[PDB]
Amino acid sequence: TQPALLRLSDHLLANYKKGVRPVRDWRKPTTVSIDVIMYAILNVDEKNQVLTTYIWYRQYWTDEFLQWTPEDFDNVTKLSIPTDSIWVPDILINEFVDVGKSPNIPYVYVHHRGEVQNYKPLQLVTACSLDIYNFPFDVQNCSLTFTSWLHTIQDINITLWRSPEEVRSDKSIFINQGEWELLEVFPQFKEFSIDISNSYAEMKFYVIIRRRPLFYAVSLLLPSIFLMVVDIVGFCLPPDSGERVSFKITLLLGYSVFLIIVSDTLPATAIGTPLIGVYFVVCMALLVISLAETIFIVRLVHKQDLQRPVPDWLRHLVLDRIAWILCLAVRGLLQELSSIRHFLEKRDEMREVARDWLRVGYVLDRLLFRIYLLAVLAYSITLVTLWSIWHYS
Amino acid sequence: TQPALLRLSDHLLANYKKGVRPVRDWRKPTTVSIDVIMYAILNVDEKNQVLTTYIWYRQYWTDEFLQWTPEDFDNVTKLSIPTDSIWVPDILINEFVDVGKSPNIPYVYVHHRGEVQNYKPLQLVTACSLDIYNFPFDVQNCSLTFTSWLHTIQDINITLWRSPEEVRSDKSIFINQGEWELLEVFPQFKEFSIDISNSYAEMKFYVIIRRRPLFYAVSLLLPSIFLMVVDIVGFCLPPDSGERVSFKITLLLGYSVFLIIVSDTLPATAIGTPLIGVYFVVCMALLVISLAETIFIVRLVHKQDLQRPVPDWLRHLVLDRIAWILCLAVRGLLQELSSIRHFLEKRDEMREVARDWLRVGYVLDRLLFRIYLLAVLAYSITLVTLWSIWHYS
Amino acid sequence: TQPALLRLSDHLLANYKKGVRPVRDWRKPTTVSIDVIMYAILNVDEKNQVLTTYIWYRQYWTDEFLQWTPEDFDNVTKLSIPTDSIWVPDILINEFVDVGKSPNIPYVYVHHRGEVQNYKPLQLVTACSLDIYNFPFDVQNCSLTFTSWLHTIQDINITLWRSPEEVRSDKSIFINQGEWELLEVFPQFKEFSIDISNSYAEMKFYVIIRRRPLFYAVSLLLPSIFLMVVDIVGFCLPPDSGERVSFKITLLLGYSVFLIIVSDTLPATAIGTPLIGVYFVVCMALLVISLAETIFIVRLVHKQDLQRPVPDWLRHLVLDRIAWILCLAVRGLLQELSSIRHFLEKRDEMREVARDWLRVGYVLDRLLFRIYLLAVLAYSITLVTLWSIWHYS
Amino acid sequence: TQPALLRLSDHLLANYKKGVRPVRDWRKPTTVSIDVIMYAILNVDEKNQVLTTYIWYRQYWTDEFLQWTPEDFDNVTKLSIPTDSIWVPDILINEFVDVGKSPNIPYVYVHHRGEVQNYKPLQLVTACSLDIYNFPFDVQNCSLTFTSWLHTIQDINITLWRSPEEVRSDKSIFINQGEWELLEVFPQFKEFSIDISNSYAEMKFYVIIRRRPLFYAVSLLLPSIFLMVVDIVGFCLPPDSGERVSFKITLLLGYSVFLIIVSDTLPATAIGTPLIGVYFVVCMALLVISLAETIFIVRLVHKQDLQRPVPDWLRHLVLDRIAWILCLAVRGLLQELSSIRHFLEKRDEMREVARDWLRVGYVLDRLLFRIYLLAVLAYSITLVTLWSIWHYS
Amino acid sequence: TQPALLRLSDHLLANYKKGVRPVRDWRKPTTVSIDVIMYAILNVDEKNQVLTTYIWYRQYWTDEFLQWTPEDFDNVTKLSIPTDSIWVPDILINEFVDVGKSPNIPYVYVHHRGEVQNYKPLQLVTACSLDIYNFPFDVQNCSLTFTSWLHTIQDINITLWRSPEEVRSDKSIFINQGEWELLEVFPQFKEFSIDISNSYAEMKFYVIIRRRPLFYAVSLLLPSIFLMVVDIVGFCLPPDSGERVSFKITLLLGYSVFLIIVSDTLPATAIGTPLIGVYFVVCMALLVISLAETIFIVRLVHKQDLQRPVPDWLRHLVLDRIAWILCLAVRGLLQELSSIRHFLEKRDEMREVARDWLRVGYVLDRLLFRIYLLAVLAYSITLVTLWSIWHYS
Ligand SMILES: *[C@@H]1O[C@H](CO)[C@@H](O[C@@H]2O[C@H](CO)[C@@H](O)[C@H](O)[C@H]2NC(C)=O)[C@H](O)[C@H]1NC(C)=O
Ligand SMILES: *[C@@H]1O[C@H](CO)[C@@H](O[C@@H]2O[C@H](CO)[C@@H](O)[C@H](O)[C@H]2NC(C)=O)[C@H](O)[C@H]1NC(C)=O
Ligand SMILES: Cc1nc[nH]c1CN1CCc2c(c3ccccc3n2C)C1=O
C-alpha cells in the first residue's frame, strides 16, 4: 500500500526504546558535535560574581537505529521527529548556579544515515570570577564548559561542529549598545577528572568582554572637576572677613556627601577598591590642605593683644619673598591733656601693630595660593597624560 | 448507528499521528498565516535594553488529514479539538531573552477542508535597541520577528492573515494612559540565512511607540526654574553685609543635591547622557558666575589698610558707566592739642578712602546685575522658542 | 453483582471522550453560569496601571453524557469526579497581563441530571486605568471581564448563577484594615465583537474601591503645618541682627529637601500631578514672599554712607501708618578746638540719620508681619473649609 | 508461586480506581486527622497584611479498598506506595493569597487495615490582620484554617491526630534568634457555612507570636537621647554672641532629617501611626520651645536706640526673681568744651542703658534654663517609669 | 536471536514495579551511601537567618531486582537507565525553608550486581543561626542534615561513600573571590527521634565559613579616621572669632548623617549590635567633649560687663599651669576736662579687664588641646594593638 509518508515514521518508531544509548556495539562512544553563537550579555553582577548571558546552541550526534534507505519511501532524505520520542544526551555546564528560563523546541531533524540535529536557545546563569582592579577600563574573561554530567569518556565524547577559527571570529548577531562589548569566543578541548578511573569530556568556551567606559567617566569626573573649580574661586575671599572658613567647611561637607553616592552605585570585590579609589582620596586630601591653609592664616591676622613680630621673621618675608618670587590752675591743665594724649596713643599703637601682622598675612597668602595652584595643575595634566597613552590603539 | 456527533471525532482521530507534518506529498510546504494585535506596553527598560509587551495572537494552517464531508455527519462544518492531539508548528521570536507567563488555551477549531485555527495570548520579553538622545521627546522603533525555529523554507513558510494596511491602522484595544503611546505596527516579510543552503521564513513586525513627555517636563523644570528665581532675589542683598556669600554657597549646595536625585530616576545608555544633560550644566555654570561675581566684589569693598584708587580707574567708572548705561606753659598746650588733632585726622582719612572704594563697588554691582539678568532672560526665551517650534504639528 | 458504588463511576466513564463538547445536538450551545466573591485587594500599582486581587470563583454547566438514574445505583444522587477526566470550558479574562499563582482543585461535583459544579480560587493580575486626580480621596473603577477565549456565541454562552442584586450587596468575607475599601461589585452582560461573523459572550464585573485617606493626611500635613509654624516664629528676630536671613534660607533649604521624599513615595500618572500638588507649591511660594520681605528690609536698615530719607516718604509712613493701622597763642587754641568739635559733629550726624532709617524699618516691619499673618490664616481656614464639606455624608 | 513481596502491591492495585472516594457505603464520611508543627516564621509584612511561615504537616485517613491479611504475604504489616496512585483528599487553607514553593514527597504509608499516612512540609503565604498600635511591644494573633475545598460535611470531616494540649505546648524545633518569638499554637474545630444546606468542616489553628523589641529600642532612642543632650549644651552659649540662633536651627534641621529615615524603615497601617509616634512629636515640640526661648531673648538684649526699662518690670525681675528662686577768647573756649562734653555724654548714657537691658536678659535666661531642664527630666523619668512596669513579669 | 543490546533493557524492565522498595526479604533495610562537594556560597542573609549554597551531590544504593550475568549479553557490565523508571529514595534536608531551582538529570548508572549510581547538582535554601557579635571578623557554623523523610531506620539507613577525612579536606572546586571563605565540611552520623518507636537516620554535614574582612574595614575606618582629623585642625581656630562653634556643629551634623548610612548597609540580629557598634559611640562621645570644651571657653572670653577674676583663680592658672606643664572762667575749664578724663578712663579700665580674661582663656585652651590630643592618640594605638594581635596566625 501507499497511503502517505507517515509510513516512514511508524516504520522508524514501531519498536524504538528511548532509554537505550543508540549503538550496535556497546564499546564505541557516541560523539556529540556542538556549536555556539553568543547573542546578548544580559547582566554582569560584580558583587555576587554571577554572569547572565543568552546564546544560540546546536548539536548533532549519530543514531544507529534511525536509518532507512530513501527509496521505498518516495525519496525522503530527512524528516522532523518530536524531541521526546528519541534518545537525547545530557549536556550541561559546570558553572551553573541557577536555571534560566528558555523556550522549548519540540522537534529535531533526522537524516537518512542517522544524523540527528538539534537546535535550541539557552539562557545561562553562570558563575565566573570578576576582577575590577581598573574599574571602567576592564576586560573580563569568563568561561563556559559544556560537559556530559553522567556518562564518562567511554560513552560520550564532545567535539566541535566547525573549525575553531570560524567560531572565534563570529560577532554577527550580537546585540550592541548595551554597556558591554564582545571581543571573542575561543573554544578549547580538555578532559576532566577528580578521582581515578573516571574521565569526562568537556569543551571550554572562553568569553572575553570589555566594558564601555564612557558614561562612568563623565558621571565621576564632572562632579570631581566641578568641586575643584569652586575651591579655587574661594581663595579670592579675603581671610580677615570671617567667611573663608565657612566657605571651606561647607564645600568639604558637600564633597563627602558625594562619595557615599559613588559607593552606592559602584561595587567592590573581596580584594577591595579599584585603582580609581586611590584617585578620589588624593582629591580628598587636597581639600584638607586648603582647609588647613585657611585656619593657619586666620589665626595669624587676628586681633589678640598683639606684639610686634620678629624682625628676623619680617625681613625674609616682607623683603625677600616679594623679590625672589613675587613682583597752679595753668599747670593743672596740661597734666590732664597729657593723659588724654596717652589714651589716644595706646589706641593708635595697638592699631599699627595690627597692620604689620596684616601685611605678613597677605604676602604669605599669595605665596600659598600659587603653590596650591601649581600642584592642582601638575596633578591634573598627569591624570590626562595617563589617559592619552591608553587611548592610542 | 447514530449515537451522537462524537462519531466525527473518533473517525477523525482513530489513527492520527501528531508527530508527522501533515502533507500527502512531502515536497510541498505547510503555509502558516499569522496576525497580531498589540494590547499593552508593560515595561520599557532603558538600562538593560529590554521591552515587555502583551499581544493577542492568532494563526491558521492546512491539515491534509483532518478532512471530512459534512454530510454523513449531520451537516457539521466545524468542531473544536484539544490542542495536544494534533500537529502544531513551532513559531518563535528571534528577539527572546526570557519566557513570559501566558495563559494556556486548550482548544482549536477545525473546518471541514482541514483549516485549523489557533487563538492564544502571549506575553513577550524581547530585546530591542533604545536610543534616548532626546530623552522625553523620543520615538522608539523595536522589532518582533516571528519565525520557525527548526523547519526551513521548504517545510514551513509564513504569510499574513489579512492585508498589511489593516494591520497597520489597528489601535482599537490598546490600553492608554500608561506613559507610552502606540503609533503603528508595520509588517514585513524577509528570509533569514546565516550559512548557505539553510533559509528560514520570517515576518518582522515593527512596533513604533512614543513617550508622553508631560510629567518629566514638570518634574525637571519646576525645581530648575525655582532655584533660578531664588538666585535673582539674592542679588538684592548688600555685598558689605557678610551674608551674600553664605547665601550663594548654600543655594549652590542645594542645587548639587538635586542633580543626584535626577540621575537616580533617569538612566543613560552606553552613548552617554541625553541632550537635556547639556541644559543642566549650562544652568549649573550660570550659578558659578554669580558666585564668582560675589567673591570678586566682596574682595573689593572691604577694609584692609587701603589706598585711594587709581584716578584712571575711577574716572571711567564713576563718570562714564553711570552716563552711558545707568541713570612755656601756654606753648606746651597746643603742641599736645595738635597731636590730638593728628590722631583724629588719621582716623577720618582712613574712613573717607573706604567710602571711595564703596562707591566703586555699587556702580559696578548694578552693572553686573543687569548683565546677568540679561543673560538669564535671553537663554530662557531661547529654551521656550525651541519648545514651541516642536509643539506645532 | 453488587461490589460497591464504584460501579457508578466506571459505568459513567467507560467510553467517555473528554475532548468533545458534550451535546447530543451540535446546534445548541453550552451555557455556563458563573459567580464571584471578592476576598482581598492585594496590590494597586498606580505607575504600571496594574491591579492584583484574589477572588473565590464557581461555575456550573450541563453535561449531556454524565447522566444516570439514581435507582440501580443505591440512590446515589451526586458524586465527585476528578477534574482532568471530563470536559472543562475555557473561561478567561480579557484584562490579563500576567498569570497569578492559584491552588489546584482536583475534584468536581456531578449531579444525576448532568449538572457539573466547579469551585476554585483565583489570583488575578489585571490591567485597569487609574486616575489619581484627587489623590487620597479617590474612588477607582476597575473591570473584570469573563469570556470564552476560543468558542463563539453559538458554542458557549455565559450567564449568572444568582441574581445581580445578591452579587452587588456581598461584602461578607472581605479582608479589611488594608488601605483599600470595597464598595460594590456590579455585574453586566455584553457581547464582544471586533470583526464580523464572530461574537463572543462576556460578563463584566465592575469593582469599585475607595482609598482610606487617613495616614496620607497626617504624613503630609504634619510636616507642612510644622514648617509654617517655625517660619512665623522667625519674624520675631530683629532684622538688623544678621541672623534672620540665615534663618530663612536654612528653613527654605529644609523644606525643599522634604518634597523630594514626598515624590519618592507618591507616584503620578501620565496626566501629571494630582490636585494636592497645587497646594504644595502655594505653600512653597508663600515662603519665598517671606524671604523677599526679609531681603527687602535688610537692605533698608543698613549703614551705607546714608542720606536723610524723603520727607514725603517719611510723613505717610511714620505719621499715617501708625494711626490708620497700628497703635596769638590764645587764638591758636580755639581754632584747633573747633576742628575737634567738627570731627565729633560728623560722627554724630551720621549716627542720627541711621536712626531715622531704623525707625522706618520697624513701622514697616510690623505692617508686613500682620499682612503675612493675615494671608496664612485666610488660606489655612480655606483648606479646612473644603475638607469639612467633604466629610459630611 | 512465591517470587517476592511485590505480589502484595499488584494484588492491591490491580483494579484500583483513584478517582473514587474510598467507601463501601456512600453514606459514611471520610475522616481526616491532621497535625501541625510550626518550624519558622519567614516574613511578617505589615504593609500588605501578609504572613509567611513554614510548617511540617501530617495527616491520615482510612481507605476501605487497601486492606489485606498479613498472612499469605509473609507477615507484611505495612508498605510504601506512590502518592499519585491512590485517592488523596483536598485540604486547603482559607487564608491563601499566593502559592508557596514546597518540596514534593512522592510516597505514603499504608497499614493493613487501610490507614494511609501522609507526611509533607508546606510553605504558607497567608493573610492575617496586623495591628501595630504599640509597635515594638506587640503580640500578633494570626490564623490558619484547614478545610476541604469541594467536599461538604457529609463527605469529609476533619479531626485532630493527638490531643489539643500536646499541640499547644510544642516548641521543640522552632528556629529562634529571628526577630519573632512563637508563644503557642492553639487548635479549634468549627463548621463553615455561607448559604444554607452546605456546611464545610474546618479546623482553626491560632498562631500567637511576639516581637523581640531590643534592636528597635536602641535604633530609636540612641539618636533621640543624643540630640536632646546636644540641645542642653547649647544653652551655655551667651545669647548676645550671634551663634545660639544658628546653633538651634542647625540642630532642628538635623532632627527633621532623622524622622524621614524612621518612617522609611517603620511602616504604619490604615489606622495610622503607633503610640510611639506620639512620643516623637513631643520631643519635636520640646525643641521648638527652646528655639522660641532663644528668639525671645535675642530680641531683648540687642542695641536698638533703647530706652530705660519699666521700673515695675525691673523691680520684680532684678530683686524678686534672684531672691525667691536664684541665689571774649576765654569765654569762647569752654562753650566749645561743653559741646565736646555733650557728645561724650550721649555716648555714655546710651551705653549704660544697654547694660540695664543686658542684666535683665541674664537673670531671665538662667530662670528659663532651669524650667526647661526640669521639664526634660520629668518627662525622661516618666518614659522609664512606664517601661519598668512593663518589664516586670 | 541477537538484534542489539537493547535486549538487556527489556529483559531488565519487562515486569518491573517502581513503587516497591527493592528487597527480596522485607526485614533488611536499603543502605544509601551519599557524598557532597560544596561549589559556591551564593547568599548569606543575616536578617532572615537564611543560607543559600550550591552543592554537587551523589549517592548509590543496591537494587535486588536489577541484576544480570554479563555473559549472554555480550559482556555488558553497566548501562544507563532513565531515572523515572526505577525506585528512587526520598532524601531531603531538615533545614529547608524554600525550594531551589536545580537542573534535572534524567539518567542513572546500573552495574551488574544491582548498584545504582545517581549524580545530581542541588541548590539549597536552608536556615541556620548566624551570630554576628564580631561583625567583620566572624566565623559561621551552619548545618546540612540529609535524612529520609518517610521511611524509618528499619527501611532506609544512610552511610558515607568515602572516608570522613577525604570529605573534610576537599576544597578543589570552590569558587573563591566572593566575600566568603570555605574552611571545612565535616560529616557526622546521628539518629533522629521526636516520639518513641520512630527513629530516622540522618547525616549532618557541618559547613564552616569565614568572612573576608577587607572592604568592610576600609569602608568604615576611612570616614571614621577622616572626620577625626578634621576635628583636630578645627582647634587651631581662635575661640574669640565666632567660627569655632559653627565649625563643630557642622562637623557633628555631618558625622550623624554618616551613621544612618552605616546602619542601612550593616544589619543586626535579635541580640543587638555587634562589638564595633561600641567603637562608634566612643568616637561619637569624643566629639561631644570637643563641643563642650568650645562652648565652655566661648562663655569665658566674651565681653559682658565683666569684673576682674579671682586672684586665687588667676595665680594657679597664669603662674603655675605655664611652669608645670607648658613652657571763675579758668576754674570752670578743668572741672569739665576732669569729666572728659573720666569717660575715657572707664573706657580703658573695661578694656584691660577684658584682656585679663582673654589671657586666662588661652593658657586654658592649649592645656585642653593637649589633653584631648593625648586621649585620641592613646585610643588610636589601642585600636591597632587589638588588631595586630589578631592578625598574627
Ligand atoms: C464604572 O465604569 C463603568 C464604565 O463602563 C460605568 O459604566 C456605565 O454604567 C451604566 C449603568 O450604571 C451604563 O448605562 C453605561 O453604559 C456604562 N458605561 C459603559 C461605557 O458601558 C459604571 O457606572 C462605573 N461605576 C461607578 C460606580 O461609577
Ligand atoms: C486570638 O484570636 C481569637 C479570635 O478568634 C481568640 O479567639 C477566641 O478564643 C476564645 C477562647 O480562647 C473563644 O471563646 C472565642 O470564641 C474566640 N473568638 C472568636 C471570634 O471565635 C483567641 O483567644 C486569641 N488568642 C489570644 C492569645 O489572644
Ligand atoms: C479577546 C477574545 N475574547 C474572546 N475571544 C477572544 C480572542 N480574540 C477574538 C477576536 C480576535 C482575536 C485576534 C487576535 C489577533 C488579531 C485579530 C484578532 N481578532 C479579531 C482574539 O484575540
Residue numbers in the entry:
A (entry chain D), B (entry chain E), C (entry chain A), D (entry chain B), E (entry chain C): 8 to 334, 397 to 462
Q: What did the study's authors say about this model?
A:
For example, the FDA approved treatment of diarrhea-predominant IBS with alosetron led to severe ischemic colitis in many patients. Iterative classifications and C5 symmetry-imposed refinement produced a final three-dimensional reconstruction at a nominal resolution of 3.3 Å for 5-HT3AR-Palono (with 91,163 particles), 3.0 Å for 5-HT3AR-Ondan (67,333 particles), and 2.9 Å for 5-HT3AR-Alo (42,065 particles). The backbone oxygen of Tyr64 interacts with the carbonyl group of the ligand’s pyridoindole ring through a water molecule. We find that the 5-HT3AR-Alo and 5-HT3AR-Serotonin MD simulations maintained an interaction between Arg65 and Asp202 more often than in any other setron-bound structure, and that most setron-bound simulations did not appreciably form this stabilizing interaction.
Setrons, competitive antagonists of 5-HT3R, are effective in the prevention of chemotherapy-induced nausea and vomiting (CINV), radiation therapy- induced nausea and vomiting (RINV), and postoperative nausea and vomiting (PONV). In the present study, we have solved cryo-EM structures of the full-length 5-HT3AR in complex with palonosetron, ondansetron, and alosetron at the resolution range of 2.9 Å to 3.3 Å. Overall, setrons stabilize 5-HT3AR conformational states that are non-conductive, but appear to lie between the apo and serotonin-bound states.
